[PDB]
Structure formats: structure tokens, C-alpha cells
Amino acid sequence: MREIVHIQAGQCGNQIGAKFWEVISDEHGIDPTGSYHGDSDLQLERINVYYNEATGNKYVPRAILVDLEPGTMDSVRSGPFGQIFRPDNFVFGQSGAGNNWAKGHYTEGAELVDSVLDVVRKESESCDCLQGFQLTHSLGGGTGSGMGTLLISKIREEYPDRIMNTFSVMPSPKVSDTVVEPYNATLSVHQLVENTDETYCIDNEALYDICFRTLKLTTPTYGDLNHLVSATMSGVTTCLRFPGQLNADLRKLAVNMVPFPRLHFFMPGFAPLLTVPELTQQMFDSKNMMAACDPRHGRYLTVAAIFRGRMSMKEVDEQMLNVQNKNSSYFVEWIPNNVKTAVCDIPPRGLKMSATFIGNSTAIQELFKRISEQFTAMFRRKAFLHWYTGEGMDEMEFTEAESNMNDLVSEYQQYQDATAD
Amino acid sequence: KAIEENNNFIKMAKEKLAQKMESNKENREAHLAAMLERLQEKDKHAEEVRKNKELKE
Amino acid sequence: MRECISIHVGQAGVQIGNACWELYCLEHGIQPDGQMPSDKTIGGGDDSFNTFFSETGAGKHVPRAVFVDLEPTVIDEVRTGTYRQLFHPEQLITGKEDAANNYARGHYTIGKEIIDLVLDRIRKLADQCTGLQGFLVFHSFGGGTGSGFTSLLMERLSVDYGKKSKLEFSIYPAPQVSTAVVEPYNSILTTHTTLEHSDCAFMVDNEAIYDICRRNLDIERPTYTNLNRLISQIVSSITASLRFDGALNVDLTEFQTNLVPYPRIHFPLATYAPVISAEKAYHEQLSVAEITNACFEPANQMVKCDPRHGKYMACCLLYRGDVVPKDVNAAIATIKTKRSIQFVDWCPTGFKVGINYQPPTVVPGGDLAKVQRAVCMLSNTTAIAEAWARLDHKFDLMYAKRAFVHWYVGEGMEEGEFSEAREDMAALEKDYEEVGVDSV
Ligand SMILES: Nc1nc2c(ncn2[C@@H]2O[C@H](COP(=O)(O)OP(=O)(O)OP(=O)(O)O)[C@@H](O)[C@H]2O)c(=O)[nH]1
Ligand SMILES: Nc1nc2c(ncn2[C@@H]2O[C@H](COP(=O)(O)OP(=O)(O)OP(=O)(O)O)[C@@H](O)[C@H]2O)c(=O)[nH]1
Ligand SMILES: [Ca+2]
Ligand SMILES: [Mg+2]
Ligand SMILES: [Mg+2]
Numbered sequence: 001m002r003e004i005v006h007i008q009a010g011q012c013g014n015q016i017g018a019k020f021w022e023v024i025s026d027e028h029g030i031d032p033t034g035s036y037h038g039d040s041d042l043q044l045e046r047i048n049v050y051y052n053e054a055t056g057n058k059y060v061p062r063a064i065l066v067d068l069e070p071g072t073m074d075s076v077r078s079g080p081f082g083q084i085f086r087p088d089n090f091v092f093g094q095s096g097a098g099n100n101w102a103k104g105h106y107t108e109g110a111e112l113v114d115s116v117l118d119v120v121r122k123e124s125e126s127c128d129c130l131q132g133f134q135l136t137h138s139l140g141g142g143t144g145s146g147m148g149t150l151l152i153s154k155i156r157e158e159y160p161d162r163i164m165n166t167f168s169v170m171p172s173p174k175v176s177d178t179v180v181e182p183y184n185a186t187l188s189v190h191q192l193v194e195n196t197d198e199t200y201c202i203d204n205e206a207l208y209d210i211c212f213r214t215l216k217l218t219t220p221t222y223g224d225l226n227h228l229v230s231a232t233m234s235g236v237t238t239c240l241r242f243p244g245q246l247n248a249d250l251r252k253l254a255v256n257m258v259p260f261p262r263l264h265f266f267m268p269g270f271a272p273l274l275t276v277p278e279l280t281q282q283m284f285d286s287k288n289m290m291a292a293c294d295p296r297h298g299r300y301l302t303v304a305a306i307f308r309g310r311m312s313m314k315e316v317d318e319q320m321l322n323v324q325n326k327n328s329s330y331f332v333e334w335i336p337n338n339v340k341t342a343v344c345d346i347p348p349r350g351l352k353m354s355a356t357f358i359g360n361s362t363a364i365q366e367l368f369k370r371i372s373e374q375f376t377a378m379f380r381r382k383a384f385l386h387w388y389t390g391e392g393m394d395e396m397e398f399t400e401a402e403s404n405m406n407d408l409v410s411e412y413q414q415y416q417d418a419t420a421d
Numbered sequence: 422k423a424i425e426e427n428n429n430f431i432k433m434a435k436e437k438l439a440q441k442m443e444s445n446k447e448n449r450e451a452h453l454a455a456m457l458e459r460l461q462e463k464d465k466h467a468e469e470v471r472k473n474k475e476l477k478e
Numbered sequence: 479m480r481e482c483i484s485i486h487v488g489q490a491g492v493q494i495g496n497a498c499w500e501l502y503c504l505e506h507g508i509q510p511d512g513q514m515p516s517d518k519t520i521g522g523g524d525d526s527f528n529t530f531f532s533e534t535g536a537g538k539h540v541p542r543a544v545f546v547d548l549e550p551t552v553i554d555e556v557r558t559g560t561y562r563q564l565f566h567p568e569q570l571i572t573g574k575e576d577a578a579n580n581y582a583r584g585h586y587t588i589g590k591e592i593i594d595l596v597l598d599r600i601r602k603l604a605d606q607c608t609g610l611q612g613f614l615v616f617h618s619f620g621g622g623t624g625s626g627f628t629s630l631l632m633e634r635l636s637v638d639y640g641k642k643s644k645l646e647f648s649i650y651p652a653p654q655v656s657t658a659v660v661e662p663y664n665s666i667l668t669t670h671t672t673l674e675h676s677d678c679a680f681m682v683d684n685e686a687i688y689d690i691c692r693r694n695l696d697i698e699r700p701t702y703t704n705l706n707r708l709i710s711q712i713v714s715s716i717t718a719s720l721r722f723d724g725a726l727n728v729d730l731t732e733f734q735t736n737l738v739p740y741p742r743i744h745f746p747l748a749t750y751a752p753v754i755s756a757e758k759a760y761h762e763q764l765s766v767a768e769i770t771n772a773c774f775e776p777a778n779q780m781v782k783c784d785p786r787h788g789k790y791m792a793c794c795l796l797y798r799g800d801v802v803p804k805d806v807n808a809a810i811a812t813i814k815t816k817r818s819i820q821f822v823d824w825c826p827t828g829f830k831v832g833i834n835y836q837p838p839t840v841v842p843g844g845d846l847a848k849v850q851r852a853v854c855m856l857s858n859t860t861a862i863a864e865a866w867a868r869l870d871h872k873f874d875l876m877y878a879k880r881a882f883v884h885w886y887v888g889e890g891m892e893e894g895e896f897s898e899a900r901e902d903m904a905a906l907e908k909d910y911e912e913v914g915v916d917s918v
Pocket of ligand 2: 487488489490491493494547548576577578579580617618619620621622623624625649650651652655656657661684702703705706
């Protein structure tokens, strides 16, 4: 298990995808043409996880860039690392989706889906040992929300024994005021609970709140929010990208992090947005969470912590023990040794020391309940259904999406209330 | 008796092992069969969605 | 003859194999290329070291060993490392996809694709032997391969080799270096399924070794490289009886006779001394009495338990280096009066002693001091059931909520297997309780 196949769908998916590839190319010492210009051997040791080796020692991302809207094709190709992508992996439609899930999932996106599946199969066939897939998308749009979830269900059929990882971006009224985003998110959640192995909840409300209150910016653009997401996505893939023992592949992470199949929604975190005890307190603090939820309103089923930089590992061990002792009630007693910690030598660009946090907390229900409240505000008066029932859907399917996300919250609550004796 | 018991142990280890490895293949295949059958049920639902758009026009 | 084939399963097995074989080479004067200048009989021989090494006509001395792992990266470093010339390529076996810390993938799913190849390769080593004694299986309890594939292998080795002996060196997990939340499941699973097919199993508690590296060697945060060098010294003390000639040398099988009172009670506690840094060892010669006394200090044990709150069914002292029987006897008499050594009523209390004259060796650029004499105590104590108890409690906490069970069921396992495995450990804990009760 080495090669992961990246997929980016929609505006959000492609732009966070673009930033992801910019950062990891810089860390691995790859320039916009795709040549190796670095110094350390650790940059190349697990390069094959995300990069294909073409002729003339070219390193090409294993990325599949997808959208129903053209124009997003131009922005990615004109961007800083536009040249490095494989031209045949661009699979772009005609009329767009216009923030409609039923267009992405059932009708207009369903027509473009087989031409994407060709690119996936071509990339997957060449993999020495394919481990799985990582999608990047929003759940508030139309393409990434609906076609991205169709792609998930379709890739599952042809690769049921590979890992399906996602970086699903949750919508927020503070960042985007499109009124039907709560409908799109809830429909996507209904698919994600059933068909993904692990979903990172990158929440725009938390990204807004961080940019305003911590980073001091009075009104943040999509560029400011992405600076945090690219730092997070770089962090959570550090175990996959460099030499290490812990969470080194997508199944080993999944096995350690996911104690129940449906409960695979992680609360990401990053620090700083410095000393080892400060890092350790910052990453466990609610203010550094990329999902807008308070850990102290529930319990951690499992946690993965990734430290990056030259630092005393003795100090890291003492500190991670310190917070588990001090915050003991916020970790379920019935899963022993559920907090794991890796340390990578190579720090990211800019910072000398950083810390990345993946937590499977029962407090993640606060994010689903928030979407559930914005959903039921519209659905109980049958508002805006003509966008969806026109494209072919039934009310029954809307009700099942609400019930499935209510069950998910009920199950997170069950295990939060669970006790050992 | 030493031979009889040494053979019995080899016999029953071999039979215990073959029963588990066949039982495991049944269980794994049935788990994967149910996963695909649920995924194929979504294709039949998506076909009714696309028909109820054209049969409403 | 009396050959011994070492099988190293999974990362922890493989890397402990590197340590052990590197150490055996330095002990016998074998070079990295395989040559042994002091060995005059070319192509073969009946010497003591030939229990662990075959000989090619070109004079190469080749470990009687197989390295198995379900992924390439750890075994690749043996293929390209310092001792690459020591092993034939067919001794080093790798698959592509690992068991992902899942007993199911190791025993069933991924494991079944490589098991026939592994047995075939063990058979090429077995047919090289004129009088095969048995196997030494090196594996972790916690890993998917170390648990799942090991169990599978042991079941198959009982089929193909009958009652021919099978010893284990089993790495028991610890939170300081453990990489997986599901290690208790894997540990109980493999312990259950291996139990009928193992004759003797030396458990090594990673925490016990970790604490020793912190306390005795002053390593702030011990690595696997640190732990494995210590483990290989203990492993070498246990296998030195097989690998060396000696007047007062006692075979390992003769210790086993005393160590295993019933087939299921086959888990001896290992304790080793002296573990000391070069700085502290300078102008500090440790006598026979000092190192013997260190065996009854529980800080020196390979497994965290308290023998003093349990009962003894056997005590064996494996000495190497500058040791003579007089000194050993003096030291034992001193201990008998001054320490908490209570035997069960149904055993005899006499300590069993072996001495190998070849002194202990150190790997260059290591942490251990080179000492003139050393000792490994192998004892059969009811206290080692504490290691089962701790591990069984971790199992129950998770299994009560079925945490992570879906990963095992997805790969073909039933809930029946989990509870069957847990009841065997419940029985095993009951068995260690029973043996300590007095007779009537
Ligand atoms: N964090 C972040 N969120 C974004 C970005 N671009 C869009 N979004 C969010 O994505 C949601 C809308 O989805 P889009 O990705 O624009 O829609 P799409 O998937 O392209 O679908 P169509 O627009 O219907 O083609 C809104 O909630 C936005 O706040 C970005 O660069 N970063
Ligand atoms: N003492 C010691 N323990 C190790 C070493 N490598 C791994 N471990 C321990 O072994 C357990 C993990 O199992 P591994 O042996 O790494 O995994 P594996 O058997 O290769 O199985 P998979 O990787 O899941 O296929 C944990 O308890 C680790 O602490 C080592 O070199 N020495
Ligand atoms: Ca010879
Ligand atoms: Mg768009
Ligand atoms: Mg491994």
C-alpha cells in the first residue's frame, strides 16, 4: 500500500486541491515543471504515494481534476503549479450545476461521471499497490456536493476493498449566503455515512471564526480560509508522505481512528495558527479546531496527534501524558490508549515547529445538529423543493437524509453516554 | 498409542484449520456481496429518478 | 545435527532478527560476507554453531532462518543492509499489502496468499537438516502479521512437522511504543490460537525493556534500535546453550523439562543482568553474587509482574562468561535466606544452573557495557499471569462496546471467535491460579 489517487471536484474542491498540491510540492522539493530540486533523501522516499514518475525524471501528481463548470479549468491551469498536472486528467463539463445536488448526483453530473471513471481506472491500473482515494470537495455546492458523492459511490463499486478518504468542506451562512446549502450538506452526509471510511470535517464556520478572531482579518476571503485548510491537509498527510511507524497508510489510520463504521467524521486541528507544552495545549483547545465544535461538550473516542519539527521527544511524551491526565473525563474510558502521537523531523515552510490534531469526538454532533437545524427550518414548510423534485427526486429521499443524520447524532450521543462498568 | 495421538493432533489441526479458512471465505464474500447489492440498489434508484424526470415532461 | 530454524514474522520479528543475527555473528567470529576464518572444515560440520548456521562449499555461513512480512519496507533494509550477503534471497519473503494491525488480514485475507510459499521456503531449510530439533518464532502480539500470520504459520507447522518443538519469542505490547489501539484484540486472538501449537513462549514486555533502557542505560527516549539490542542479549543467553560447546553447559531442552509442568503453563519469566552503561561499568566489576541477586530484583525482568506476590514452580539460572559453580552456589545460598522465593508444595525448590564459558559480546557503537560475566534467569512463576490479566482487561473494555470489531468482521471473522478466545484466556488465568493452590 503506497499509491493514493487524489480527486478534486467543484470550485471548493479544486481550489483547496490546488493549495494542497502547492504546499506538498514545496515540502517534497518539486517545482512547477515537476523536477526534483531539494537536498534531503526523505523528500523522495515516499514520493510515490502522491506522484507518478514520468520520463526525464518528471514527477506528476496523481490528481483527477473534475467540474461541471468550465472556467475553473482555467484558474487551476493558470495557477502557480498549473503546468505540473497531467492534461488528460482534466474532465470538465458544460453548463455547470448552480448549487444543485440533484444535478450533481442524479442527472447532469451522472452524464459526466463515466468520463471521470475512465481517468480513475487509468490511474488506478498503473498503481503498483493502490491503497485508496482522497476526494476534496464542498458539501454546500452542486458538483462537489452531488457529483463528488456519486463518484464516491461509483468508485466503491469497482474498488470495494480500497480506502475512501474525504476532505469534505461544510457550509456556513457566515461565509456563503446561498440559501439551499443546508439541503446540499444533509444529502451529502447521507452518502458519506454509508460510503466513506474517513471524512475530515473542514468547517467554513470554524475557518471564518479563526480568521476573524485569531488571525485578526476583519472580513476574510476564500484565500484566507484556504491558508488554514492547506496547512491542515499537509499535516494529516504527513504520516502518509514521510517515513514513520504510526498511521503510515490509509487503512492503518482507519483501523486506529474509527471504532464504529458510521462514526468516521474527524475534527481537524492545527497549531500555531513556540514551546512543546504550548503546542500541546493549543491543539487540544477548541479555538484551534477546524470544525466548529467544543471538545468539552463531549468525549474523544480516538485522537491522532502529529508533531513536526526538531524537538525533544521526551518532552512530547510527557506533554501528551500531561493532557490525558488533566483532561481524563474527555476521553472514553472504555477504549484504552486511544490517543496516539507521531513526530516528523521536517517542519513545514515558514514554521519551525507545528502540531496537527485529528480527533474523533462525539462533540462533532454540534456540527451535524447545526446543519440539521438549518435543514429543518426549510424542509418543514416544503421550501425550495422544486429545484430537487423537478430534477426527479422524491420527498421520501429528503426525509431519509434527515433521519440518517439524526441517527448519526443519536449514535455519537450513545457512546458519549457510555461508561465502563 | 503415541503414534495414534500424534496423528490425531495433526488430523484435527488440519480439519479445524480448513473449516475456519472456508468459513472465513464465506463470511468475507457475503459481507462484500451485501455491500455491492446495496450499491447496485442505488443504481436502480437513480434509474427511477431519471425516469421520473422524463415521465413528468 | 540438532538444528534449529528461526522464523521472524512481521516488523518486530524481523528487526529483532537483525539484532539477534548480527549479535550471533559477532559471538562466533562470522563476517558480514558469511566467512568464518576460525572454521577450518569448509562446506559443513557438526560444531555447536552449526545448529544455527549451515555452510556453503564457498565457506559462507548462512543463518538457518526465514524472514516473513506482508509488506516489503522492513525486509528491504535487510536485503540492502550490512548483512545482505548473509542470507539467500529465498530466505527473505515479502508480500505487497500488510495486515493493517488486524489479526483477520494476517491470518486469513492477506496471509493465505503467501502461506504456501513460506512453508515451501521453510521446507528447503528443513531438508538441509540431518536432525532438526525445532523452530524459534519471533513475532509481536500487537501487529496484524505478528498476530494473525504467526498463528496461521504455527497451525500449519503442527500439520507439516507434527510435535517437533516450537518455541516463541513474543513481543507483548506497551503504550510508549505501540502503534495501534486494537493490540489487545490481536494479542488475545493470537495467544488463543497459538496456545496448543507452542511448547514454550518467552514473552518480552516492551514497557519492561523500555524502562530498563531509561533506568539502567540512561536513554531518555528509547527507540526500537535501543530495545532490540537488549532483547538480542536476552535471546542470546537463552540460545547460547544450543550454539556453544561446554562441560558445564546445560541444553535448553533440559531447562524446558523443568519450566513446563503442564502443556498450557509454558510461559517462563525472563530476567537478565547486568544491564549497565560503559560510564557506570568503568572500575566496577560485578561479581557472580551481584548479578545473581539482580535476577530477583523485579526491575530487571522482561515482563512487568511481581514474583514476590506469586509462587515459583521452577527457577533456572543461565550463566555466561567468567563463572564457576562454587561462586554460583555461594550466591544462591545467600539469596535463599534473604529473598521472597516461595515455591508451590508440589515442586522441588532446587535451582537449576548452566554455565557457558564464551563471555558476552556487545554490538559496536551500542549502549550496553561489555562485561566479563552475565546471567539470564528463566523462572516459572504464577506472577506472569498478571501480564495476561492487564491485557485481558483492555480487551474487555473495548469488546463490551464492540469497538473496532467491524474491522475484523469485515475481513471474515465471527464474534464467536472473540469470545472463544477470551474464554481460553479466562481459563488460562484460572490455570495459573490453580497451580499455586496447595495440595490436599
Ligand atoms: N474553504 C473554502 N470554501 C469554499 C471555497 N470555494 C467555495 N467554498 C464553499 O463552497 C460552497 C459552495 O460550493 P462550490 O464548491 O462553490 O460549488 P461546486 O461544488 O463548484 O458546485 P457548482 O457551483 O454548483 O458547480 C460554499 O459554502 C463556499 O463557502 C474555498 O476556496 N475554500
Ligand atoms: N521490541 C520491538 N517492538 C516492535 C518493533 N517493531 C514494532 N514493534 C511493536 O510491535 C507491535 C506492532 O506490530 P508490528 O510487528 O510492527 O506489525 P506487523 O507484525 O508487521 O503487522 P502489520 O504491520 O499490521 O502487518 C507494537 O507493539 C510495536 O511496539 C521492534 O523493532 N522492536
Ligand atoms: Ca565447519
Ligand atoms: Mg461551480
Ligand atoms: Mg508491519
